[PDB]
Amino acid sequence: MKSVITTVVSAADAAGRFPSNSDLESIQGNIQRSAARLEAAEKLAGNHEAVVKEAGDACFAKYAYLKNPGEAGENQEKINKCYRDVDHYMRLVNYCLVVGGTGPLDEWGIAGAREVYRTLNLPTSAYVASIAYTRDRLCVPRDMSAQAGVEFSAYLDYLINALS
């Protein structure tokens, strides 16, 4: 997983160097920013049932054609597997808020997605519709604090940019 830790000690390992002042100095920011980026972690972890529910129907409200026969969400079990994917992506965003980098996203949701979504006819626009609907519904003093909202939206946007 790419984080603040695993970046600076692989740059040191590739050069064969001991951890210098720069290495130690990079982890000092992992002390300051982790008060903000971890506050969104339990906020998403405790209320993760009202966000998948509110994103999944917004995806089908933007694209009502998916429930037609021959399409991706034609029957009930396909919609059940569709809500499971938004739950998976919100779990990976919850993980990335905890590591402090885009490690778990890039390993478990991003790498190889552009092959399986084209092979199984899953439209990526309907995937980014739910993430964008989660993105604009962030009441910055009500959902979380200000910097926790910044850290949450910066990981939502990253998944949006990577899926498109």
Partner 1 sequence: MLDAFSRVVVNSDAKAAYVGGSDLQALKSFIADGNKRLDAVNSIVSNASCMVSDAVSGMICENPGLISPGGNCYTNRRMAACLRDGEIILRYVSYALLAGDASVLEDRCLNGLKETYIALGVPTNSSIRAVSIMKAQAVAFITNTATERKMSFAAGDCTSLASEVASYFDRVGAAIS
Partner 2 sequence: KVVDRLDSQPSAAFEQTKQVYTFSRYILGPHRAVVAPVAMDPSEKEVVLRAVYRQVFGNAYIMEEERAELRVMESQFLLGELSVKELVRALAKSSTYKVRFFEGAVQYRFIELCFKHLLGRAPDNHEEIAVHMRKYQQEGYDAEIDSYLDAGEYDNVFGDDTVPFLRFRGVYTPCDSFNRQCALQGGWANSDKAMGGAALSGYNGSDGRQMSTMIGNYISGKPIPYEKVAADTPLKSTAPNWYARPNPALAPQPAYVSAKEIAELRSRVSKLEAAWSVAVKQSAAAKDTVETWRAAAKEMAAMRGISPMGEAYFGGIAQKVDNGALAQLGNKASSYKKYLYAIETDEVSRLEVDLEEAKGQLRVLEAAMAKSTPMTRTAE
4 binds, among ligand PEB, a second copy, partner 2, none (CB under 5 to 8 A by kind): a second copy
Alpha-carbon distance values, 22 to 17, 71, 76, 87, 93 (Å): 12, 53, 54, 38, 28
Quote the least distance from Cβ 63 to partner 2, whole Å: 11
State how far the Cα of 55 lies from the Cα of 129, in Å rounded to an integer: 8
Applying CB under 8 A, does 145 fall inside the site for a second copy?
A: no
95 binds, among partner 2, ligand PEB, partner 1, none (CB under 5 to 8 A by kind): partner 1
Applying CB under 8 A, does 125 fall inside the site for a second copy?
A: yes
Q: Is 96 annotated to bind ligand?
A: no
Nearer to partner 2, 84 or 137 (CB): 84
Applying CB under 8 A, does 27 fall inside the site for partner 2?
A: no
Applying CB under 8 A, does 76 fall inside the site for partner 2?
A: yes
Applying CB under 6 A, does 82 fall inside the site for ligand PEB?
A: yes
140 binds, among partner 1, a second copy, partner 2, none (CB under 5 to 8 A by kind): partner 1
State how far the Cα of 94 lies from the Cα of 79, in Å rounded to an integer: 23
Q: Applying CB under 6 A, which residues contact ligand PEB?
A: 21, 24-25, 28, 33, 43-44, 47, 50-51, 54, 56, 59, 66, 72-73, 78, 81-82, 85-86, 88-89, 108-109, 116, 120, 122-123, 126-127, 137-139, 142-143, 146-147, 150
